[PDB]
Amino acid sequence: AAVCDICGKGPGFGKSVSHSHRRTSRRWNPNIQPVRAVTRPGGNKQRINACTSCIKAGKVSRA
Amino acid sequence: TTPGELRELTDDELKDKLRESKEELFNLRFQMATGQLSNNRRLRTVRQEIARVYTVLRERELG
Amino acid sequence: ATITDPRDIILAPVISEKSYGLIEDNVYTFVVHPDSNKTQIKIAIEKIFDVKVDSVNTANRQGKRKRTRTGFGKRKSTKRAIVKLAAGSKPIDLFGA
RNA sequence: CAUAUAUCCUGAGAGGUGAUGCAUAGCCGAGUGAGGCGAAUUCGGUGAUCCUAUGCUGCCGAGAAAAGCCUCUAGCGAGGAC
RNA sequence: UGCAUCCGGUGAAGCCGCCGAGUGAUCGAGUGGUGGAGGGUGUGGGAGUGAGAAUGCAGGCAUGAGUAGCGAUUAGGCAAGUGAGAACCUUGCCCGCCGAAAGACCAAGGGUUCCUGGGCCAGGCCAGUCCGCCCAGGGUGAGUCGGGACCUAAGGCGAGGCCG
RNA sequence: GUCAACCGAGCGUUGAUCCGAGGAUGUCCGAAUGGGGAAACCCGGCACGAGUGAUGUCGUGUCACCAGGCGCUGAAUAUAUAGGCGUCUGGGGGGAACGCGGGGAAGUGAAACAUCUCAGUACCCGUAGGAAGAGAAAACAAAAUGUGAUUCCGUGAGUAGUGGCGAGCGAAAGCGGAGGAUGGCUAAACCGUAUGCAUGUGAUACCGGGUAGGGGUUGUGUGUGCGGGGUUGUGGGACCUAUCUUUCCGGCUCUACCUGGCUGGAGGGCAGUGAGAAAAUGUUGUGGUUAGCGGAAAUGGCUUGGGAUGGCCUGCCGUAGACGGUGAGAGCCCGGUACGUGAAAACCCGACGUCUGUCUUGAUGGUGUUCCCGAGUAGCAGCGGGCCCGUGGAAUCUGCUGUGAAUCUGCCGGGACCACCCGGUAAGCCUGAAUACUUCCCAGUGACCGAUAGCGGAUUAGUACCGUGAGGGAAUGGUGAAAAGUACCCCG
Fold first, then answer.
1. Where are chain B's structural domains?
2. Phi/psi zone of residue C41: left (φ > 0), alpha (ψ -120 to 50 degrees), beta?
3. Which of A12, A57, C56, C90 qualifies as a FRET site for A37, CA 20 to 30 Å off?
4. Is B31 touching C (CB cutoff 8 A)?
5. Per-domain residue ranges for chain A?
6. Domain C3-96 has what CATH class?
7. Residues of B in contact with C11 (CB under 8 A)
């Protein structure tokens, strides 16, 4: 959900600021997607968690 | 019997001496329990003889 | 190099009026090692005294708790073996009456 | 092919043995306390909340598991059973 | 406590008195007793430096006061014994109480309280020669009893695993 | 051994007890790991031994899980993979403080309270090391022809600032110091080689030219690995291309001949367990540590006293008049002190060596052009964090989400932004010293406490006791110089 199985990208932590400037803790999660990758041209498909940046970088081989 | 000549005996007679000292200790324990022997130091001496024989055997085995 | 003898399983005899009453029945009481079993005791007694053993009975006893100026102290716990010999019955003289 | 108080299974209890033993009312002494001897023991009544009974009958609210035991093959087998 | 001086087992401090002293906090290199190892003075330096009270804290002890109470709804008596000592301990004979218990046996819990011998400062709501108290020694024996080595329930833990 | 003696037995000049170093043994529990379990107690498998007439029984090894190597096999299923089997090497847990990276309060202050403060504190999670972290400019600076990695200390300064411009919070440049390593290695362009995957005018093609072959040093690609080569800001480097050139020998650059490059072997160096590659192995250093030993001088006189270590008076030593003990204030009585001395062994520091790596197939300063200089990165946008800076005109740094470049007339910074100047060269990695701390060990110190004090704990102390539990938590020192601790008699 929050950790990429490829690059180790993890959630950041910050504050949520209201108009009255009340600061409350919140999280910034990565865009983690479940992708069936093809590690080898043999064709084995395994369900892995990859961020959308990893998909963009072609790092997850969804063949 | 000091370790000096205790190191002269071979393995077999060393085992025999260990056996005989063990029977001696058994007899001394029974005599003390029934309360008839006077020399209390015999138990200590026989225990230390057993320890010495064990030490010599272990030294020979380890080299 | 461990040399296992039958004589470290048996520690000491028990000297008491009950023990003597049993001895006149040819039943002997020993203090044995706390981690020995009945058949091990029977084998050891047979090897030591070259006799035939009918049965072995064992009891565990908790040590007595005693009071001291430093506080409460406990004596060691012992295991007792009550050994009955066969009808051949050569008495164990090492028991020293 | 069978309806049988047939057959089998389970099963309180009665009876026999266990029991020429053991125990006992007592009687002798002995006096902390130890010892020896030791009669008769049928027949009825009452009667369980216990047993047959994890039975039987009724009812709805519809009332553990596994081991164990038996049997079946798969499979081991030249020795194996009583 | 720096420095400088002086006193001390021919008796310092501390404590208890006597006799005095200063305007005050206080003083007595004045004295007697007790005691047994360190003190005084001057001049500087530094303070955990002064208590009567916070329903203050710790220890010791008063007042109430030789007062209340001495823990059920059964009940004790006598004779003899032991003993320094007896209402309470022992023995005997009575009397009374429970008797679906206040009898007998287990489980949980306790842990040696069990037995023998000894004791009598503490404890026992009195006393105690007695005791579940104190001291020493002794005592618990299993193929079949209750458990394990047999089986599972609820539930627990949980190889990998999924999720975070 | 001691409380702590009372006995009973014994050892020791043939060297005990005792002190230091190195070994051996080391039940059971505990990360606990053969399986189970209510920690310290139950039940095993395998192998090899012991024992028994045989079963029973005993001894010694070994049997957890996961991770990473290597080898074998390869499900559904075909390629194969997941998985399985075997075998090696690691891990696991504990620890007082100090470090780094994450998460993150409230009481409180603002005389209320929400922004703000408290405070990035308490606490929690993950991880170390003897220290850590940071570190070699995409830095400051301001026109000085200036500094030159990082860290820490003092100032700058309670200043500039910031803030319901409230309570409050609060820099940096510069300058003075500690320490110095202004330190090293890479990636790419290009070469060579090896290989995987595609194919192949499958020949006039690839060696440096001239000669002669040949149809593959493949012919072409592409990917990967390995070895060269290249580590830079005045840009640097490859590609070229002249000039100058400080070992020898050998084998290769398709093949032989004459020319230019790759590669081994001998000197010569040069470095070293170091950041700059690594594991070792020897000899030596009155170098160090871990037990020790020696070490001057009063039985002095008189007096008081139970006792002299007091008073008075004589000597003596002093590289020693530190401090304790001894029957009352001891330099000369004892332990010691100044000062000297001492290590079989182990360990720690050095040094010199074997050893290893490495340069010599090499080096110089020159000339004009193509290629390379770290990509899902920088930048931009949205929402946050943190900086003196509380979103503000908000630079520099940073997290998530989108979008997304250029390789030097490129890019980043100089507090919005633009132009010009100046500085630097991001998206790769290592790095010692200066600094923080003390569970523990050794040696000392105190205008610190002296038993209601000082640690809770001078005494049974994290004990008794209290609590189901996490946890809470006491009180108790002094005879005498020596026990010489009151024989014996009397009342009881």
1. 1-63
2. alpha
3. A12
4. yes
5. 1-62
6. alpha beta
7. 29
